[PDB]
Amino acid sequence: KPHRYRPGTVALREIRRYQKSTELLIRKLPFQRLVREIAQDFKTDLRFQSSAVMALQEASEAYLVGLFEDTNLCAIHAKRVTIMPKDIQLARRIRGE
Amino acid sequence: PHRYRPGTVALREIRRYQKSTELLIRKLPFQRLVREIAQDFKTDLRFQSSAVMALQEASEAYLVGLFEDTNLCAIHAKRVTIMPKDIQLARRIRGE
Amino acid sequence: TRAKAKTRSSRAGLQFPVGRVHRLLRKGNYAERVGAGAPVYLAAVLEYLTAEILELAGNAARDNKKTRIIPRHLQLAVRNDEELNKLLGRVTIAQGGVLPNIQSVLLPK
Amino acid sequence: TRAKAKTRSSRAGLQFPVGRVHRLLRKGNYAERVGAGAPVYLAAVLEYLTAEILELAGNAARDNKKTRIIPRHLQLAVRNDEELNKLLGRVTIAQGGVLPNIQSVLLPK
Amino acid sequence: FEDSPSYVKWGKLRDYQVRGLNWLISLYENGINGILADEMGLGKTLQTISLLGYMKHYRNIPGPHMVLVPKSTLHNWMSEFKRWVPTLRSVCLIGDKEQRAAFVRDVLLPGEWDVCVTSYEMLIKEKSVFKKFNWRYLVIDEAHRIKNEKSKLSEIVREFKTTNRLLLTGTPLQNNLHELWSLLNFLLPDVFNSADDQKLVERLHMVLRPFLLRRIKADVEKSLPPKKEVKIYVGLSKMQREWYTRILMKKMRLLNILMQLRKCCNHPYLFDGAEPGPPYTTDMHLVTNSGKMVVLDKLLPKLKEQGSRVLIFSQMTRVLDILEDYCMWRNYEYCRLDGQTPHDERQDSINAYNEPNSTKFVFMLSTRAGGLGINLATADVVILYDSDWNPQVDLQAMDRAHRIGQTKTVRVFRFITDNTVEERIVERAEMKLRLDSIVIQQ
Amino acid sequence: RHRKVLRDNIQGITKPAIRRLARRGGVKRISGLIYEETRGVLKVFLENVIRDAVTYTEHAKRKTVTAMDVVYALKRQGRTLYGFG
Amino acid sequence: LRDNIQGITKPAIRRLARRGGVKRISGLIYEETRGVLKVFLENVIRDAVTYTEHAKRKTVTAMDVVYALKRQGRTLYGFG
Amino acid sequence: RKTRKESYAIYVYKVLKQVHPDTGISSKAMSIMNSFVNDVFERIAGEASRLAHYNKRSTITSREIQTAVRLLLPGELAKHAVSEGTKAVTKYTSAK
Amino acid sequence: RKTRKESYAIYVYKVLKQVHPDTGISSKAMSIMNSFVNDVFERIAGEASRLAHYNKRSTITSREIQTAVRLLLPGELAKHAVSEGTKAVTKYTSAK
DNA sequence: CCCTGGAGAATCCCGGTGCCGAGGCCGCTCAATTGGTCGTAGACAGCTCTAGCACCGCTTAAACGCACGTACGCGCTGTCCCCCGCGTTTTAACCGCCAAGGGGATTACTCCCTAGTCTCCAGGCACGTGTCAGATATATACATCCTGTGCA
DNA sequence: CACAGGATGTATATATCTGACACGTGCCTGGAGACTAGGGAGTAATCCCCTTGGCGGTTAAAACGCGGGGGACAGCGCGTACGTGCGTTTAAGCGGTGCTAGAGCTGTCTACGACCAATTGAGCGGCCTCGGCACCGGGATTCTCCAGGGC
Ligand SMILES: Nc1ncnc2c1ncn2[C@@H]1O[C@H](COP(=O)(O)OP(=O)(O)O)[C@@H](O)[C@H]1O
């Protein structure tokens, strides 16, 4: 009785919404904590400007988006609709990573 | 009438050509193709033999790498046969 | 007497700093000597590229019903044009987003 | 008078030309000035890389039962090492061929 | 107005609040904005309700009046408004976005109220709406909240179009004269518009007397046995000495050297690696490795065989956790009041500690937790594990037990260490406290 | 003696955040094993970039990493970024 | 001059694919491979001709080819 | 008084007003345009420097800049930019 | 006569005799090794040039070379190369 | 039955051929040695401001956990036609040789362009400042998706 | 299987508010005008080399046809993992304290290390010569693949 959308309409709606927007889809404080933790391995007593974290977040989001696009292309190649670790690995292998 | 199954001769050729190092395209047809392509950019272009040799080396390396990626795509699609769709997917993922 | 100072940009009809370009070329360690016309040529090329990208960005901004240009408009203009996309194929624009593109297989039918 | 000539290559215990590297750095338009230790350091790095590649290629050639090194041996050595492969990942070696690698799904059942 | 008014209900006022009302009426007659520093426990809210009721009734000016209070006192203020002066019309702004919109549309925008009571956060949220009303009176409770300029609340409250202004703070002076100048600039922007023995003191008193009213909690009660203080010095343990030398030099990343020396004087286990290995045992390691803990371990049993009911105030919840471990080891009775304790849990713990007959013996409080509430009468002994930069914070901590409900003298044992950051912290606090005394107490 | 740990910082990159990134990428259905792979690839990318940026900062003899250092590291890796310098 | 691309023969393409490591080749892949080779060669020859014309020469040199490949991202070792 | 940093923002604004008379640009977009100009300048200058080194010359000239432009820009942009640079050079030479 | 041509062939041969005493080389392999040495030299020198420009300094020093090596070479190669360069510079400083 | 036999391909072991790598000489140019200078960079000092550590209080959006059902991935099966292996005929690559001439490479001379200096001064940059474009909220109006219902 | 209607999401005018963008002003420092000196590059001439055109004979490789089995692709069924919506929880985000140093940024001073110049002698490039390693061919093994007990 309660209204319910078919499984896949909300996915397309969200695709359109996030392809219309421009903001960052990763939380700032978790990303900053991750950046600090990674930096602690390479060198201690390191300080980060706020602009550096923003640049890292922008670059990381762009890289992940491009990866997901190529992954979706590979999944469509395999006559599927879902993306898989196989698709991610194939995309990275062809790109040379 | 002895006859091999459809695919063993292909594997033998794979092994021998992966062990060999020589060029796999005919030199005179490649040279004619290079001159014809250069006909569009400038007339009366003379080529050193080394230039055509280097062009052939680069072209063969590029095609071999492309075929490797295409085979990977075909195996991902659960196929043993490579297709133009596989070549196009490889080009799109490479960035061409 | 001392003739009035006329800028090399005005001499060549450019809106770009020919003198600054000459100084950057001399200080950038590209060669020992720099020609007279090379900075003028380079400034003109930079001017044309800026004009092209700005024309496309202004078209996009008017298409979105705004007066100011934003990085979203810049990314929209850089994509959707083949030549600029080839020129800036490995460049990430901050606060730019992506293009609208949904694969026809995913579309419901 | 002057003392006997002593090359900086011998003064640093190397086999690569420090003076030639210094001249190439000076005439390459890389900076306005070049320090004294930079040619020595760069020659040492180049010698290390060359020795590493040559050792790998010699091992490959011995595994092929040949004395002289050929481009096939160089390609085998480069592509069998992860770090050297990453260094030369965008480089094509003439008359090198490819590594023998057949995918497992294509093998006979 | 030498006598209590008639608009007040549910009991009559007394002399100190009637004199405060006279002072505020004179302030309004002279058209000056001022500060009430009556100290907690004298009826500042009662006096403010009296002033608003007076201005509503005796003067024919029912206008838009706003009272800014902390969120923790909104219900108490509304209950007092309904109780003492039910004549007035009072409206409160709190809740979610939809509740705020509903309230403003239903009651605020139509404009049938007299006093609007809102919290600081609701003022920041609804500044655009609140800026419309032709504000007449602006009573800000806990005026030391705006003691710092360059702050968003301070600038927002300055940008209102107001006629009469009032401040209700128990500690007008906290560290230096800049914050007092900021409060006085909010009151009278023109008079003080820059920067604040014969050259000083006398001039300060003659300037501030027409603007400040303060009466200590000593001329009304004649009770509450006087505060007793003992400043106990503590020898540094050996591991504490080793870590102190190590941090004095400079793998553990240490950014704030002062903030490392501070906990190092508290307990070495607060670092990483100072604690013993994986066995995770809890048997006499804590006591011996900390000199303050050795002193406290000696001190507690005597008080327990005596009056007991000790409060321990600390500036680090990690130190509070270490004290919890110690209390479990000694099998004492403990209650933890922290900044992470939910509101319902706080009240139940406070009531349980303040039951007529309880087995509780230790109550542990963060030095800045709760705030201007918290009734702890059964206590007799207050232990200041750490000393803070602002001495008024410790004064509030030690008057959380030194209130009208107490019957035995409070003994404030303050732990300090030789030649550490504690020495300079206590020296700074003493300088600030002496400045506060010389400036305000007269 | 009382201490506890919250979570690993790689888990701060949440499943809904990865879903949003895939939505911008143009993905309809997503497996459940994708999140581990995405965390791994992001960690590798960040490690490379941060190592290069730290090398630049150490060369400049500073203790603070700057947006310019990040831009230089990205340009070295071939991912030129416009907007921060 | 025409039909020179058909000088690139099906057996040659099959040999290249075998060195790449493929087993079964679809019949439509030969024309596609010819087009790929044509575009790659056109780009490289365009850059080489640009270098040759800048040098004011009429002969394309192996160094011109190497410089073109280098600026395209395909460094070649063995020709200078 | 902070130190002086030089950006192409003024000239980008002049070009913008010439192209679209009534439009604006935000700070981030101006930063992006400045970065784009710097990147293109560096590409062209480096290519011209390598051309000069390859031909064993010590001078960067308009010929080198034209060749670098044709090597970097993709086609229609290349020819239009070459025409613009030639026009500017002719005007500069004939004027003063 | 024909102008002189420089190459690293004799030094590569000396290194080869040092590492494998009884192994020879061919002309094609020598060309490849000369190209490899030139390529690595160019990469390191360009990185050091960019570092000097980024820090706004006019001199390329051993610090610049070390930083460039750490940037370009991956991992263990970088560590061993840094150690070798440090050793060579120490020997040169002491024995000069 | 899986194991046997036949057949082809791959590998290993010897013997004659050629050309290419390694060595040995000569000239010349480039690197080493001294001497002299100055400008870059190291070192220091003063200033200001953002970053950092340990907390409190509060709001609220976003993450998290749960249960349902439904498309979707995955395996299985059958069809057929396309790709492959092999033999035969044909075409053109390959090799060697010869001949001619355009053009690449070098050299010498001269001049014209550019580096470097010093005045001179206007364009560009930092600092304030006020008004308009865009962001937000809100109540309509429109488009879209989903389900039920006569069709059955 | 094709509409009607409902419920939801989304685009649309419209009013408000704010903070950043575009503008104006003062100053200062780097770019333009005038000038000289020197050496890089243009221009002409010459030489020889290396590219192109043509011809003949061999022979390996390409093109063509054929016969057949294995792979691609469509269809079908299932049980299962993921999307959708909902109710609870948590931590992000914002606003405040309270310090000190700390690290980056600018202005001066001075010394040592890199450039520049002249001179000179070994190191390196180019030219010849010669033997041994690679190569080519030949012949006896060993491994592997495909019928056939459907051996
Ligand atoms: N009307 C009153 N007369 C006397 N004492 C009072 C009154 N109201 C409260 N108190 C005492 O003062 C203490 C706190 O008073 P406080 O909350 O400051 O009053 P107000 O809220 O009116 O300022 C309480 O412990 C209470 O015992």
Side-chain angles (χ1 to χ4, degrees), chain A, chain B, chain C residues 1-108, chain D residues 1-108, chain E, chain F residues 1-2 5-85, chain G, chain H, chain I residues 3-96:
Chain A
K1 176 60 184 60
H3 181 98
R4 219 165 173 277
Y5 281 111
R6 300 275 294 276
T9 309
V10 187
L12 297 177
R13 174 185 309 157
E14 284 184 342
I15 288 181
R16 296 194 187 97
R17 169 149 61 99
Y18 295 116
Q19 285 184 309
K20 195 173 300 300
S21 61
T22 57
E23 69 274 345
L24 300 178
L25 314 174
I26 290 187
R27 288 278 152 270
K28 272 168 44 59
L29 216 54
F31 198 84
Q32 185 174 180
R33 282 198 295 262
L34 175 61
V35 169
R36 298 189 182 284
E37 178 209 355
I38 295 187
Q40 219 106 330
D41 270 11
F42 295 136
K43 184 185 193 301
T44 58
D45 309 11
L46 272 182
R47 294 151 71 259
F48 275 85
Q49 286 193 358
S50 296
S51 306
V53 190
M54 288 293 103
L56 281 179
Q57 194 166 337
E58 288 280 352
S60 308
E61 289 200 359
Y63 175 79
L64 285 174
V65 169
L67 188 86
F68 279 134
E69 187 164 354
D70 296 292
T71 294
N72 187 254
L73 281 175
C74 293
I76 296 300
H77 186 69
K79 291 181 188 174
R80 284 185 282 102
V81 186
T82 83
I83 60 172
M84 284 187 174
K86 303 151 46 186
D87 310 327
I88 311 273
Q89 294 163 10
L90 174 62
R92 296 236 301 175
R93 177 69 169 280
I94 298 179
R95 279 148 66 99
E97 299 180 359
Chain B
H2 176 61
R3 174 177 277 267
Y4 279 104
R5 287 295 190 80
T8 44
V9 187
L11 287 170
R12 303 188 183 284
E13 296 203 314
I14 284 184
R15 282 161 192 151
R16 61 166 293 193
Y17 285 135
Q18 283 194 340
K19 266 160 63 177
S20 65
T21 67
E22 81 283 353
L23 295 176
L24 301 181
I25 310 182
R26 301 287 98 178
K27 294 180 172 55
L28 270 63
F30 195 86
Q31 187 179 183
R32 289 197 296 255
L33 173 61
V34 172
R35 298 189 185 275
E36 190 201 31
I37 294 184
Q39 202 79 16
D40 167 279
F41 305 114
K42 188 183 187 301
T43 59
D44 199 331
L45 275 171
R46 305 156 81 87
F47 282 86
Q48 298 181 357
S49 306
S50 321
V52 180
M53 273 284 300
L55 287 166
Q56 190 160 349
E57 289 278 349
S59 304
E60 297 208 24
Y62 173 73
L63 290 180
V64 168
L66 188 67
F67 278 139
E68 232 169 2
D69 292 329
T70 293
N71 191 77
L72 286 183
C73 296
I75 296 183
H76 175 88
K78 293 187 183 60
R79 275 184 289 108
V80 294
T81 304
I82 59 175
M83 292 183 168
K85 60 167 73 172
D86 301 310
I87 291 189
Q88 294 161 9
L89 179 71
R91 300 273 303 285
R92 175 67 170 79
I93 306 299
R94 288 158 77 93
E96 306 171 13
Chain C
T1 61
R2 182 71 122 80
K4 273 300 300 302
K6 251 141 55 186
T7 54
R8 299 197 263 176
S9 312
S10 172
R11 284 187 167 96
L14 302 178
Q15 303 273 355
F16 256 70
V18 181
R20 179 176 298 182
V21 172
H22 199 41
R23 186 245 300 173
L24 292 182
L25 276 173
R26 226 198 320 279
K27 294 291 199 59
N29 302 132
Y30 308 110
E32 290 190 351
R33 305 154 65 98
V34 178
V40 180
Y41 205 112
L42 186 46
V45 173
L46 297 180
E47 203 181 70
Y48 174 75
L49 294 181
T50 298
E52 184 89 2
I53 183 177
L54 281 182
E55 178 186 1
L56 300 181
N59 288 346
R62 192 183 58 246
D63 208 307
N64 205 274
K65 309 164 192 304
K66 295 187 189 305
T67 292
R68 301 210 203 108
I69 300 185
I70 66 178
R72 174 57 170 171
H73 305 154
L74 291 178
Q75 168 105 324
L76 281 181
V78 165
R79 321 303 162 198
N80 297 334
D81 188 7
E82 324 282 359
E83 310 282 52
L84 287 181
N85 190 24
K86 297 184 68 64
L87 178 59
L88 299 174
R90 299 163 177 264
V91 177
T92 310
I93 288 181
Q95 308 281 14
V98 301
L99 291 184
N101 187 237
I102 299 188
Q103 299 289 299
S104 296
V105 174
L106 306 180
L107 288 176
Chain D
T1 176
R2 51 173 53 88
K4 274 295 303 176
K6 201 168 304 176
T7 65
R8 280 180 286 176
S9 304
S10 70
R11 195 177 296 274
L14 299 171
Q15 309 283 346
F16 264 61
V18 171
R20 181 178 290 188
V21 175
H22 188 95
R23 184 183 57 91
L24 291 176
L25 280 164
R26 277 195 287 101
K27 298 200 176 308
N29 285 321
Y30 302 113
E32 188 166 357
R33 313 197 308 173
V34 174
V40 190
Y41 204 114
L42 189 46
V45 177
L46 298 185
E47 167 168 328
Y48 174 77
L49 291 180
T50 296
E52 189 78 16
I53 299 200
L54 285 179
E55 181 179 35
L56 287 175
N59 290 331
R62 169 144 35 80
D63 288 3
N64 198 14
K65 296 176 176 295
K66 319 198 72 53
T67 294
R68 312 211 193 106
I69 305 184
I70 66 182
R72 174 63 172 170
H73 309 154
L74 285 171
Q75 175 88 340
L76 284 182
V78 169
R79 303 312 182 193
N80 284 327
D81 198 309
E82 258 191 351
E83 293 126 347
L84 285 190
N85 177 33
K86 196 180 306 303
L87 179 66
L88 306 181
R90 313 216 53 81
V91 184
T92 294
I93 286 179
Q95 292 173 351
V98 294
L99 298 185
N101 243 322
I102 310 183
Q103 299 292 321
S104 297
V105 74
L106 305 184
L107 293 180
Chain E
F1 209 175
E2 79 292 339
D3 56 330
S4 174
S6 59
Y7 49 72
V8 291
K9 276 72 182 179
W10 192 70
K12 299 180 180 180
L13 274 61
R14 293 182 183 174
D15 46 349
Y16 46 101
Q17 48 279 71
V18 87
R19 291 182 177 182
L21 181 54
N22 293 323
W23 189 80
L24 293 177
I25 293 177
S26 63
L27 212 66
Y28 175 68
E29 293 299 330
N30 279 323
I32 298 296
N33 323 324
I35 296 176
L36 269 187
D38 303 302
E39 300 316 90
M40 186 58 182
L42 268 78
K44 295 193 300 179
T45 302
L46 176 56
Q47 291 167 173
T48 296
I49 296 180
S50 296
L51 172 61
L52 288 184
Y54 180 90
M55 268 274 299
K56 165 64 190 60
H57 306 146
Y58 273 52
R59 314 305 170 84
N60 188 21
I61 179 60
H65 292 341
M66 190 207 315
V67 178
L68 274 169
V69 290
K71 183 190 183 69
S72 63
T73 55
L74 274 160
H75 292 346
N76 187 29
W77 279 63
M78 291 290 285
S79 304
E80 294 293 76
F81 255 112
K82 187 187 68 62
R83 196 68 30 83
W84 294 89
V85 181
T87 313
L88 278 177
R89 324 167 84 173
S90 44
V91 295
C92 63
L93 176 55
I94 27 170
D96 206 292
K97 191 172 182 178
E98 58 97 353
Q99 301 189 341
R100 284 195 263 105
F103 166 82
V104 61
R105 181 192 63 254
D106 292 5
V107 194
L108 188 66
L109 285 180
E112 63 282 16
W113 50 270
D114 290 336
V115 179
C116 190
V117 193
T118 175
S119 76
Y120 305 137
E121 303 84 10
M122 300 303 104
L123 186 71
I124 307 184
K125 293 289 192 178
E126 302 286 344
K127 61 168 185 177
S128 297
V129 183
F130 265 147
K131 224 179 308 301
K132 304 302 183 184
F133 280 86
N134 50 331
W135 290 119
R136 303 204 56 81
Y137 237 105
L138 177 50
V139 184
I140 302 180
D141 196 17
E142 294 330 285
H144 61 84
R145 165 71 174 84
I146 66 174
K147 81 192 189 309
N148 176 32
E149 291 314 308
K150 331 302 180 306
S151 66
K152 292 190 167 303
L153 179 63
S154 47
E155 53 199 12
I156 287 177
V157 81
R158 272 174 173 79
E159 85 173 333
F160 282 180
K161 45 184 197 305
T162 59
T163 70
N164 306 116
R165 295 177 287 268
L166 190 65
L167 296 178
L168 268 69
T169 167
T171 63
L173 187 64
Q174 291 269 329
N175 304 334
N176 46 28
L177 308 171
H178 197 51
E179 45 202 357
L180 185 64
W181 170 88
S182 297
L183 297 187
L184 296 181
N185 181 27
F186 173 75
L187 292 177
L188 310 176
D190 38 60
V191 178
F192 312 92
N193 40 335
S194 63
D196 279 332
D197 300 0
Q198 295 181 352
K199 301 180 181 180
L200 285 183
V201 176
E202 289 82 21
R203 291 187 174 185
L204 289 182
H205 288 154
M206 70 88 45
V207 166
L208 297 181
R209 187 176 293 101
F211 298 160
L212 186 144
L213 170 58
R214 174 146 178 179
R215 32 182 172 273
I216 324 100
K217 194 186 177 181
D219 53 356
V220 179
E221 290 75 10
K222 294 185 178 181
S223 177
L224 182 41
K227 307 169 55 58
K228 178 62 171 59
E229 295 77 8
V230 186
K231 309 302 164 182
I232 301 184
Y233 268 79
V234 162
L236 217 65
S237 180
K238 308 318 300 173
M239 183 146 58
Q240 287 176 329
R241 168 70 43 83
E242 164 61 30
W243 277 98
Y244 207 112
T245 304
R246 178 57 244 179
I247 305 177
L248 267 181
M249 169 54 62
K250 293 178 178 180
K251 300 180 179 180
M252 267 288 297
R253 188 185 176 189
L254 307 177
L255 268 312
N256 296 341
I257 304 301
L258 175 59
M259 183 66 75
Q260 309 299 336
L261 266 69
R262 274 185 42 201
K263 52 179 179 179
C264 184
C265 297
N266 301 339
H267 206 280
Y269 289 173
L270 300 186
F271 303 97
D272 189 6
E275 166 77 44
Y280 35 65
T281 62
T282 321
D283 52 314
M284 212 59 180
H285 297 162
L286 309 186
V287 177
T288 58
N289 296 153
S290 178
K292 291 180 178 177
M293 193 49 63
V294 155
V295 179
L296 177 54
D297 164 65
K298 158 57 51 227
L299 181 66
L300 282 191
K302 292 190 294 307
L303 313 170
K304 179 173 183 178
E305 300 175 355
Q306 292 299 331
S308 71
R309 310 293 291 191
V310 60
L311 313 180
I312 298 178
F313 292 81
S314 181
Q315 294 217 297
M316 292 190 170
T317 70
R318 319 271 299 275
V319 178
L320 297 179
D321 281 333
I322 291 184
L323 247 155
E324 300 287 53
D325 284 308
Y326 160 83
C327 283
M328 301 202 328
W329 181 73
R330 282 299 279 267
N331 250 334
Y332 280 152
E333 216 295 333
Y334 70 89
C335 305
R336 183 171 180 184
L337 178 49
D338 193 2
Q340 296 289 336
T341 308
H343 296 193
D344 192 11
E345 293 188 7
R346 300 187 177 182
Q347 188 60 32
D348 219 359
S349 300
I350 294 296
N351 285 335
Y353 191 88
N354 229 18
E355 294 296 318
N357 198 324
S358 326
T359 58
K360 307 186 159 301
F361 166 61
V362 171
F363 207 150
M364 300 160 34
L365 284 85
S366 198
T367 317
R368 282 182 183 174
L372 315 175
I374 303 172
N375 243 18
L376 300 176
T378 64
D380 199 13
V381 175
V382 181
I383 298 184
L384 271 61
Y385 199 94
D386 288 357
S387 299
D388 41 8
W389 299 108
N390 181 11
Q392 291 293 340
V393 189
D394 278 0
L395 260 296
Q396 292 182 4
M398 65 181 58
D399 64 49
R400 275 174 189 169
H402 188 77
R403 44 194 32 175
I404 184 180
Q406 207 64 35
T407 186
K408 294 186 272 68
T409 170
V410 289
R411 294 185 297 276
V412 177
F413 298 96
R414 181 197 296 264
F415 289 165
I416 328 179
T417 57
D418 275 325
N419 61 268
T420 51
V421 295
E422 273 59 32
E423 287 308 293
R424 295 176 64 249
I425 287 184
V426 174
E427 286 179 350
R428 299 279 303 266
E430 186 58 33
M431 102 176 356
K432 306 170 183 171
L433 181 55
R434 172 168 34 85
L435 178 59
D436 183 76
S437 63
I438 192 182
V439 169
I440 305 301
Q441 298 329 294
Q442 294 72 7
Chain F
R1 179 57 180 278
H2 212 175
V5 296
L6 294 84
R7 197 179 56 181
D8 192 5
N9 296 328
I10 191 61
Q11 304 290 310
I13 308 303
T14 54
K15 165 177 180 300
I18 302 181
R19 290 174 60 76
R20 294 197 287 268
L21 294 175
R23 295 319 185 202
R24 187 173 290 178
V27 177
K28 202 175 181 182
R29 270 170 65 100
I30 315 171
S31 173
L33 313 162
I34 278 299
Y35 313 115
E36 316 303 314
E37 273 284 289
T38 305
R39 288 159 183 167
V41 301
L42 183 69
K43 195 190 182 176
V44 171
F45 175 80
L46 281 191
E47 279 182 336
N48 295 339
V49 180
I50 292 178
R51 173 153 33 84
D52 287 9
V54 170
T55 313
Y56 279 100
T57 300
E58 288 175 358
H59 185 69
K61 293 179 179 179
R62 291 186 271 95
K63 293 179 179 179
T64 336
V65 188
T66 54
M68 295 310 299
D69 293 349
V70 169
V71 169
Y72 297 152
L74 290 178
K75 181 145 57 62
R76 218 208 64 87
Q77 279 182 227
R79 308 192 178 282
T80 310
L81 185 67
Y82 289 178
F84 299 84
Chain G
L1 276 67
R2 54 208 70 262
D3 203 76
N4 290 118
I5 189 62
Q6 301 302 329
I8 309 305
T9 52
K10 161 180 179 180
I13 299 180
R14 294 173 66 87
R15 298 197 224 96
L16 287 171
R18 295 296 154 76
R19 184 171 282 182
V22 329
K23 201 183 174 187
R24 276 175 54 95
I25 304 177
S26 174
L28 297 184
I29 231 178
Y30 304 108
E31 298 304 310
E32 193 89 336
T33 304
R34 290 183 173 95
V36 177
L37 184 61
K38 180 169 169 296
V39 60
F40 173 83
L41 279 185
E42 281 193 359
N43 295 16
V44 182
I45 295 187
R46 195 201 328 273
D47 289 354
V49 164
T50 299
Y51 283 113
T52 301
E53 282 186 2
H54 184 250
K56 295 169 167 295
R57 284 183 284 97
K58 309 186 183 60
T59 285
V60 183
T61 56
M63 295 303 278
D64 292 326
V65 179
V66 171
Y67 299 155
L69 294 166
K70 184 181 192 56
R71 82 156 303 275
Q72 293 200 354
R74 295 196 162 86
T75 312
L76 185 63
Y77 286 0
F79 293 89
Chain H
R1 179 66 62 176
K2 310 300 186 302
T3 175
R4 304 171 82 266
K5 298 189 60 175
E6 311 184 351
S7 66
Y8 295 99
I10 301 185
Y11 320 105
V12 166
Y13 212 97
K14 302 195 186 299
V15 174
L16 180 60
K17 283 310 168 64
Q18 188 180 22
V19 172
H20 287 90
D22 45 0
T23 196
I25 183 161
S26 56
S27 53
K28 283 294 300 302
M30 193 74 81
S31 177
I32 297 185
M33 288 298 306
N34 186 25
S35 302
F36 162 73
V37 175
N38 276 333
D39 198 13
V40 172
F41 175 92
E42 193 141 352
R43 285 189 203 174
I44 302 181
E47 203 59 33
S49 173
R50 286 194 287 270
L51 275 166
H53 196 64
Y54 292 157
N55 292 95
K56 287 185 288 294
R57 305 256 293 258
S58 303
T59 308
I60 291 186
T61 56
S62 56
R63 270 179 50 83
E64 268 80 1
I65 301 303
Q66 185 178 229
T67 308
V69 163
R70 300 217 302 266
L71 283 174
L72 292 177
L73 266 58
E76 316 307 313
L77 287 179
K79 46 186 291 189
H80 280 64
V82 164
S83 296
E84 292 293 334
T86 302
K87 270 192 279 293
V89 167
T90 51
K91 200 183 303 300
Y92 183 75
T93 289
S94 69
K96 270 96 54 181
Chain I
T3 192
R4 290 171 59 262
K5 196 191 308 300
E6 287 189 349
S7 56
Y8 296 88
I10 48 172
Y11 319 105
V12 172
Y13 198 81
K14 292 194 285 189
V15 176
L16 172 60
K17 288 307 178 175
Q18 199 174 260
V19 58
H20 277 83
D22 45 61
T23 292
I25 205 161
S26 70
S27 299
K28 300 297 303 179
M30 221 45 162
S31 294
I32 295 174
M33 295 301 301
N34 182 31
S35 302
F36 167 77
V37 172
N38 282 329
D39 194 10
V40 181
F41 172 89
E42 291 174 1
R43 295 192 204 183
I44 296 192
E47 266 298 333
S49 169
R50 286 190 285 273
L51 286 171
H53 199 279
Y54 294 159
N55 289 266
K56 305 188 61 57
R57 275 171 158 77
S58 306
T59 308
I60 290 178
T61 60
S62 52
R63 297 197 66 249
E64 273 84 352
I65 304 294
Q66 187 170 349
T67 307
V69 170
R70 290 194 182 276
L71 281 171
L72 293 177
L73 306 190
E76 315 304 312
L77 282 184
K79 275 194 290 187
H80 293 355
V82 164
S83 295
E84 286 244 343
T86 303
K87 282 164 45 58
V89 176
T90 290
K91 196 183 197 304
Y92 178 76
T93 290
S94 73
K96 192 182 61 60

